[PDB]
Design a protein around this ligand. Structure first.
Ligand SMILES: CCCCCCCCCCCCCCCCCC(=O)OC[C@H](COP(=O)([O-])OCC[N+](C)(C)C)OC(=O)CCCCCCCCCCCCCCCCC
Ligand SMILES: CCCCCCCCCCCCCCCCCC(=O)OC[C@H](COP(=O)(O)OCCN)OC(=O)CCCCCCCCCCCCCCCCC
Ligand SMILES: CCCCCCCCCCCCCCCCCC(=O)OC[C@H](COP(=O)(O)OCCN)OC(=O)CCCCCCCCCCCCCCCCC
Ligand SMILES: NC(=O)C1=CN([C@@H]2O[C@H](COP(=O)(O)OP(=O)(O)OC[C@H]3O[C@@H](n4cnc5c(N)ncnc54)[C@H](OP(=O)(O)O)[C@@H]3O)[C@@H](O)[C@H]2O)C=CC1
Ligand code: SF4
Ligand code: SF4
Ligand code: SF4
Ligand SMILES: [Zn+2]
Lengths: 155, 209, 96, 146, 342, 176, 48, 115
């Protein structure tokens, strides 16, 4: 049956993508520190298959980790567009989620979701390294639920 | 000094800073308008704006001064004054282990001589004052915005500039670029009135008009 | 406690409920309206009244420093009970 | 304590009468085009206006100009003031010329046909302050009211 | 008006426009521009979608918090349609394929579905219904796509008599499948044209103008019950149009005539594709179909929209089809196409 | 007092010159660096098996906000609005009115969790321990709207997490 | 908790719930206050 | 009191010379801007915008204020020439996404309370 075959191929490509998330080496402010602590030995994001790569062309996920300013907004959008697809965005911390504690500033974008689509929101100021990892594992479970090929088969 | 909760007073430093204050006023009477020392011992020289270069050079290079480091250069906006901007230089003397403050004034349309000739630290500090307060510094090697977005209009640190500004940014899909729009807030910043109607500090009570 | 509208929407403890014609109830389609089910007005009423033998009694909410600020309640009126302004416990004088 | 009246029974949308003869909601364009149609057809004495108690000066003059342009002088008020004699020609005829502050300097006050306690509560409170501190003599021609 | 759908604000992102719109087929070329314009002014947009949520992410930044709402629906399931319209004051239908699939054919997407959307929308008390048909829809057209547009347009007009029907010409824009279609013919060497494209006249319309007209049709009381024809300012021969595309892209243009029967067979060959056909037999008919002149119908100028010349927005669409040598060439470099004086 | 980080000169006897030449020619100090990394290869790693193993936290941890009740089940919050005033981020919006029984209670209690800096000033200001930052730190959402908390969500957080919240307040209230 | 059990209150949930984001049980925010301004309702009789 | 330190120009003739000099620099640069940033506008459009920005301040009569506008004008030119600005910053002059706002009384009356 087709519905069986496409279901199993969809699991395969879903498994590969979530099992190999390569965030861009991208970080803006305070929360970049906790993101470093998630790569540090105690949490070791690499053991889940999560590997930072500097190039946007070789990245799957953008972790927006810090305050986004008006001056910085076009640059953030640009490297997002240069990511091949599928690409996911994780908002980390209050500044990136909604402007946080500079929400009423003239120079701050009130949430990165004005500039780019967001998949997961990680609250905190900063979120702990363990909280960010929880948000990563939630992105993986989100990728695990995709039905690209099942939707194609009924299209 | 034996009241556990009260900051002790250092009378010796107050006397020395008072003496050096008169000293600077005697040598540079052409520019010095006021000299004062605070109760926590910080000396201030208030000068005419023409004397920025002569005053800063004397303090850097005089042998009984030697303020070789410019700790900070900033501006204060006081709208109630005709000269609304107060330019403040904070200087450190490593030779004598002293700090001094030199303050002058200007308005929107008056230049202040760039102090890059005395301290090369002032270059970026003046770009910041130009950008956030709109005070022009004459004879700057390169004066341009340093902190605000390219093309940003206004000088955000002026007291009459709104907290959230005038424009906000979003990504518009139609034009496939980040666009600037007039600012609207889903929740307006809530202004709190906090000042107490009862006087707190009698020693600073101003005389009745 | 929790009531429902003729439209089926639950009414919260503040009495809020989108009325019949409001489009804003579209946010609950495919999702759910979160209503806390323990209405504090109902729970504080279940508490028995405390009979005391003095004109004035003090309530701090229980737990000492873990309660509310300590306040004193006058119990001279015999047509009502004294109520804590912080926690809502009720006190009555014992016919002394 | 009357400000809570501003949150009840409020008119918030323009309304016109439908076919059944019931008021129904509509837009500003529609309602003001119906009013302009009738305003343009009529003229002169066929147009009149009555102003209420809580109407400000700007809305009053604006309506006087609009009715004057159809050539109607029938700008009326719900509150009656006798028109015989000088009428409204001289301001002094219909003003409290002494002013509220002058009550404190008067010697004799004659109140004619008025309960100032409930008509002008703070004006009445000014009479009593002068009664108290200046030994004002007050007389009343009217019903006996506390 | 309920107290919640009264306009407030200055027409910005956080304002309230008073519009509550259910947009069907919001995930395609025309839908993203429609949803972008509704979200700009502060509308509540219900976006029912058949596709994977990953394919709707470009819509998320189009509205303030809460304003864009997403629902799952199935074009043959009336209950899914009802859940998505019952709270809306305007329902916009942009559902359509340019090709047929094993599951959904031109009858289903242009007749069965729009009429099921129209029937449910009226039973649910939706005030305004907006239907997108086609300029060249005809019962006697040799494009099964256009014959289905004609049949659905009548069903929609009978199921929702107050429906506003909009008949656009072929729409160009960064995701159009019109000027991108021609610029991608370079991959096959020359450009096969029926009768060398000298017997076909087109009147393409800019996407933003179609979107602006739709937005006004919602906010304009007069638009109700009418049929509109959205067409561009100029009429071009297909040959002159395709020649202009290749000049803007700076590609070598080698047009050669291909008989109708043959170019049909090419269409049949590309249809075997199990994904998105590069071309189909129907696409052959539509491209080589003279865009009708409907003077009795009102147009964009009635809705208040000034049609944008193809010569102001072609570089915008076609600059990505250039090579590095020509990327930086400017809008004035190329010769304007010859326009049929009408 | 001071010391010199790098003000020592090398000896020039024949043996020391030879020793530095053997270091230059045979790469001795580079080999030494390889020994250090080699020793780490045989050390137990510091990684923990998250989510099965968690990081250590203390009772003071500032996590997710919750609204608390008295043991009777009445709400502790009295709508005093000191949490609202102290909040550095203006994340709290409160509205209040008399309840049916006359109690001073909130009709609106919103915390915008994307404004909040998780500073805990609000729990310091509250005079009745009504608002607390709970121990939870694992409440990531897939939408921005899911992080704008109203009073029902916050009361449900307190009901959900009361058991742990009370135990932590018990461990720390003598320091407060 | 097997050695030092938690205190029992009536209102405490008897059934823990994990993160429900992304599901039909998620939390949808909404204003909890009632309407501020009441609107005059025109009479339903035919007047004149 | 009317005696005031000059910024550059001693009178309005010296200041207007700098206005014209700045207009020439902006006029010459527009063709390069449209090319480098790959703008869809025409060189005519860009020059009409530069002209428009220069008419907003045509009523000024203070030499010191004129000098500041010229100083700010030259700062903006450098950001454009050196490509510190981006395409988004250049296109902010054209307000392409802002919808037209009514100017007359009735249209403004129907939408809201703003004067
Ligand atoms: C050595 C290096 C490593 C090599 C790795 C090799 C790859 C291993 C994984 C291969 C799995 C397949 C990868 C699919 C990737 C395609 C791109 C993609 O996923 O996009 C989604 C797209 C879906 O696109 P779509 O049509 O739904 O939507 C496109 C439009 N937008 C963009 C708006 C969404 O997939 C496809 O379009 C085609 C997928 C075809 C899958 C393969 C054919 C199906 C075969 C089984 C079913 C056939 C019928 C039943 C047969 C029963 C009898 C046999
Ligand atoms: C004898 C003559 C035989 C040749 C006959 C030629 C018939 C004309 C066929 C033209 C097909 C044009 C085309 O390929 O466009 C479809 C598609 C466009 O795709 P794209 O631009 O990348 O993005 C949109 C979503 N696909 O295509 C593409 O994705 C890019 C181009 C694909 C070229 C395939 C070779
Ligand atoms: C016949 C026997 C007698 C001949 C001498 C025996 C040694 C011959 C091996 C080659 C020696 C050599 O070339 O290394 C010396 C080289 C010098 O480096 P340096 O100290 O920076 O500069 C010299 C002073 N200017 O230093 C280096 O080349 C450094 C090499 C760096 C990379 C080493 C990384 C891997 C090391 C582990 C293997
Ligand atoms: N040049 C043009 O583009 C012109 C277009 N039109 C009409 O305008 C409307 C929009 O066209 P456009 O949006 O450009 O085409 P698109 O293919 O770009 O978008 C069409 C939409 O239809 C949806 N759709 C198609 N089939 C189904 C189905 N069986 N069930 C549910 N949804 C479906 C698609 O959803 P999914 O992505 O989920 O498949 C997509 O969102 C169409 O009606 C089209 O005929 C008319 C004249 C010119
Ligand atoms: S969210 Fe908090 S930690 Fe992160 S950048 Fe903002 S203030 Fe710093
Ligand atoms: S933790 Fe701090 S920022 Fe967050 S709500 Fe409390 S006081 Fe406000
Ligand atoms: S949570 Fe505490 S501080 Fe805030 S309003 Fe309630 S009682 Fe006052
Ligand atoms: Zn109590």
């Amino acid at each position: 049956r087709g519905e069986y075959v496409v279901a199993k191929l969809d699991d395969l490509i879903n498994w590969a993508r979530r099992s190999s998330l390569w965030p861009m080496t991208f970080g803006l402010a305070c929360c970049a520190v906790e993101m470093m602590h998630m790569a540090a030995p105690r949490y070791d994001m690499d053991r889940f298959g999560v590997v930072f790569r500097a190039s946007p062309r070789q990245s799957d996920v953008m972790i927006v980790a810090g305050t986004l300013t008006n001056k910085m907004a076009p640059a953030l959008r640009k490297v997002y567009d240069q990511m091949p697809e599928p690409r996911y965005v994780v908002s980390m911390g209050s500044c990136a989620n909604g402007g946080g504690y500079y929400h009423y500033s003239y120079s701050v974008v009130r949430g990165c979701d004005r500039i780019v689509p967001v998949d997961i929101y990680v609250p905190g100021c900063p979120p702990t390294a363990e909280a960010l990892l929880y948000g990563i594992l939630q992105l993986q479970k989100k990728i695990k639920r995709e039905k690209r090929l099942r939707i194609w088969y009924r299209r | 000094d034996t009241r556990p909760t009260v900051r002790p007073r250092n009378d010796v430093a107050h006397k020395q800073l008072s003496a050096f204050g008169e000293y600077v006023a005697e040598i540079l009477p052409k520019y010095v308008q006021q000299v004062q020392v605070s109760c926590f011992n910080e000396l201030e020289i208030c000068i005419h704006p023409d004397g920025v270069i002569p005053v800063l050079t004397f303090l850097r290079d005089h042998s009984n001064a030697q303020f070789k480091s410019l700790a900070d250069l900033t501006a204060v906006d006081i709208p109630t004054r005709q000269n609304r901007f107060e330019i403040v230089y904070n200087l450190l003397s490593l030779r004598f282990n002293s700090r001094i403050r030199v303050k002058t004034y200007t308005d929107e349309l008056t230049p202040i001589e760039s102090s890059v000739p005395v301290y090369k630290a002032a270059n970026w500090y003046e770009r910041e004052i130009w950008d956030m307060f709109g005070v022009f510094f004459a004879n700057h090697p390169d004066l341009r915005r340093i902190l605000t977005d390219y093309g940003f209009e206004g000088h955000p640190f002026r007291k009459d500039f709104p907290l959230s500004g005038y424009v906000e940014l979003r990504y518009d899909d139609e034009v496939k670029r980040v666009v600037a729009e007039p600012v609207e807030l889903a929740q307006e910043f809530r202004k709190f009135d906090l000042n107490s109607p009862w006087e707190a500090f009698p020693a600073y009570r101003q005389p009745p008009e | 406690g929790v009531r429902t509208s003729p439209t089926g929407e639950k009414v919260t403890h503040t009495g809020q409920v989108y009325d019949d014609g409001d489009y804003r109830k579209v946010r609950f389609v495919g999702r759910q309206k979160e209503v806390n089910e323990n209405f504090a007005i109902d729970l504080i009423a279940e508490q028995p009244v405390s009979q005391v033998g003095s004109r004035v009694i003090s309530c701090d909410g229980g737990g000492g420093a873990l309660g509310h600020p300590r306040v004193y309640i006058n119990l001279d009126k015999e047509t009502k009970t004294g109520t804590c302004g912080y926690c809502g416990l009720q006190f009555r004088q014992q016919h002394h | 304590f009357a400000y809570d009246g501003l949150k009840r029974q409020r008119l918030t949308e323009p309304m016109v009468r439908n076919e059944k003869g019931l008021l129904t909601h509509t837009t500003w364009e529609d309602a003001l085009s119906r009013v302009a149609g009738m305003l343009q057809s009529f003229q002169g004495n066929d147009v009149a206006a009555i102003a209420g108690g809580l109407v400000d000066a700007e809305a009053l003059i604006a309506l006087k100009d609009l009715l004057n342009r159809v050539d109607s002088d029938t700008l009326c008020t719900e509150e009656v003031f006798p028109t015989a004699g000088a009428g409204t020609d001289l301001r002094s005829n219909y003003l409290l010329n002494t002013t509220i502050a002058g009550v404190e300097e008067a010697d004799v006050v004659l109140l004619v046909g008025t309960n100032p306690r409930f008509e002008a509560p703070l004006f009445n409170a000014r009479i009593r302050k002068s009664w108290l501190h200046n030994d004002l003599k007050v007389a009343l021609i009217g019903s006996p009211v506390d | 008006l309920h107290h919640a759908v009264i306009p407030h604000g200055k027409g910005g992102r956080s304002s309230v426009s008073g519009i509550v719109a259910t947009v069907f087929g919001a995930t395609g070329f025309l839908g993203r521009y429609v949803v972008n314009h509704l979200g700009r002014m502060g509308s509540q947009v219900i976006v029912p979608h058949r596709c994977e949520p990953y394919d709707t992410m470009h819509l998320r930044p189009m509205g303030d918090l809460g304003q864009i709402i997403f629902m799952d629906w199935n074009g043959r399931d009336k209950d899914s349609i009802r859940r998505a319209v019952e709270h809306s004051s305007v329902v916009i239908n942009l559902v359509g394929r340019e090709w047929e699939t094993q599951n959904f054919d031109f009858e289903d997407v242009f007749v069965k579905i729009p009429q099921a959307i129209a029937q449910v929308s009226k039973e649910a008390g939706v005030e305004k219904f907006i239907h997108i048909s086609h300029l060249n829809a005809d019962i006697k057209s040799s494009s099964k796509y256009l014959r289905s547009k004609a049949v659905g347009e009548k069903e929609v007009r009978e199921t929702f008599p107050e429906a506003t029907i909009i008949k656009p010409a072929e729409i160009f824009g960064r995701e159009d499948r019109f000027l991108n279609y021609f610029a991608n013919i370079r991959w096959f060497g020359g450009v096969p044209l029926i009768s060398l494209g000298k017997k076909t006249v087109k009147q393409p319309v800019y996407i933003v103008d179609v979107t602006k007209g739709i937005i006004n049709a919602i906010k304009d009381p007069d638009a109700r019950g009418k049929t509109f024809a959205f067409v561009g300012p100029s009429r071009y021969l297909l040959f002159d149009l395709v020649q202009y595309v290749f000049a803007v892209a700076h590609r070598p243009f080698l047009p050669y005539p291909l008989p109708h029967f043959a170019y049909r067979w090419i269409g049949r060959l590309f249809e075997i594709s199990p994904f998105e056909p590069w071309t189909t037999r129907d696409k052959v008919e539509r491209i080589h179909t003279t865009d009708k002149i409907l003077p009795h119908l009102p147009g964009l100028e009635d809705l208040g929209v000034e049609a944008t010349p193809l010569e102001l927005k072609a570089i915008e669409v076609l600059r990505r089809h250039r090579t590095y040598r020509w990327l930086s060439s400017e809008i004035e470099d190329v010769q304007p196409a010859k326009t049929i004086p009408t | 007092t001071y010391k010199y980080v790098n003000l020592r000169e090398p000896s020039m006897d024949m043996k020391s010159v030879t020793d530095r030449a053997a270091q230059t020619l045979l790469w001795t100090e580079l080999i030494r660096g390889l020994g250090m990394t080699l020793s780490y290869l045989f050390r137990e790693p510091a990684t923990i098996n998250y989510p099965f193993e968690k990081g250590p936290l203390s009772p003071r941890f500032r996590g997710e906000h919750a609204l608390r009740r008295y043991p009777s089940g009445e709400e502790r919050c009295i709508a005093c609005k000191l949490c609202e005033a102290v909040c550095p981020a203006q994340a709290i919006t409160i509205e209040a009115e008399p309840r049916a029984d006359g109690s001073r209670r909130t009709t609106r209690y919103d915390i915008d969790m994307t404004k909040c800096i998780y500073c805990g000033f609000c729990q310091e200001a509250c005079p009745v321990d009504a608002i607390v930052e709970g121990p939870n730190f694992e409440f990531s959402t897939e939408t921005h709207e899911e992080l704008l908390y109203n009073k029902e969500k916050l009361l449900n957080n307190g009901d959900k997490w009361e058991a742990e919240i009370a135990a932590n307040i018990q461990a720390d209230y003598l320091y407060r | 908790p097997t050695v030092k059990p938690p205190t029992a209150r009536k209102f405490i949930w008897t059934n823990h719930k994990f993160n429900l984001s992304g599901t039909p049980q998620q939390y949808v925010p909404y204003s909890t206050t009632r309407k501020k301004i009441q609107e005059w309702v025109p009479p339903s009789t035919p007047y004149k | 009191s009317t005696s005031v330190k000059p910024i550059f120009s001693r009178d309005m003739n010296e200041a207007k010379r700098r206005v014209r000099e700045l207009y020439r620099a902006w006029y010459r640069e527009v063709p390069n801007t449209v090319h480098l940033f790959q703008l869809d506008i025409s060189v005519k459009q860009g020059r009409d915008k530069v002209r428009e920005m220069f008419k907003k301040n045509a009523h000024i009569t203070d030499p010191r204020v004129v000098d500041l506008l010229v100083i700010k004008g030259k700062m903006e030119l450098e950001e454009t020439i050196k490509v510190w600005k981006q395409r988004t910053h250049v296109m902010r002059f054209f307000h392409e996404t802002e919808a037209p706002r009514p100017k007359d009384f009735l249209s403004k009356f129907y939408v809201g309370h703003d004067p």
